[PDB]
Write a structure and sequence with these properties.
- Belongs to the glycosyl hydrolase 22 family.
- Pfam families: Lys.
- There is one protein chain.
- With 129 residues, the protein is mainly alpha-helical.
- 31% of the residues lie in helices and 6% in strands.
- The protein has a single domain, classed as Lysozyme, CATH 1.10.530.10.
- It has a three-stranded antiparallel beta sheet.
- Helix 1 packs across helix 2.
- It is globular, with a radius of gyration of 14 Å.
């Protein structure tokens, strides 16, 4: 499912992401925009053999099991396919663990490079939240 900007903002807020670990909603929406372009079905394989899954492009080396990433850790205890669902709950619960991991949202390279230090509020502007 391809989310609309405000549609995603509301679902994320509803799932407790607004200000989670100090990161405003604009940050999460900006990250989803540049990571998957709001598409739950997005996947991207990496050179080390791992794959990034879903709306927040969660990596298989540490966070989920795809049975094809040697060395993988499955810290979120979920098969990676679960991250491709239209219901963002799984992606959100795993993201909460990642952002609590110690590096904050810098764990998402697109956030660090295209959201960090920008007016992320613009991503939630105009939305009825």
């Amino acid at each position: 499912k391809v989310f609309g900007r405000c549609e995603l903002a509301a679902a994320m807020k509803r799932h407790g992401l607004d200000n989670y670990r100090g990161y405003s909603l604009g940050n999460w929406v900006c990250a989803a925009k540049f990571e998957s372009n709001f598409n739950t079905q997005a996947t991207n394989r990496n050179t080390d053999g791992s794959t990034d899954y879903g709306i927040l492009q969660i990596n298989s080396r540490w966070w989920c099991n795809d049975a094809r990433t040697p060395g993988s850790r499955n810290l979120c205890n979920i098969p990676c396919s679960a991250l491709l669902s239209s219901d963002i709950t799984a992606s959100v619960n795993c993201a909460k663990k990642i952002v609590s991991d110690g590096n904050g949202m810098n764990a998402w390279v697109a956030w660090r490079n295209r959201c960090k230090g920008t007016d992320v509020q613009a991503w939630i502007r105009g939305c009825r939240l």
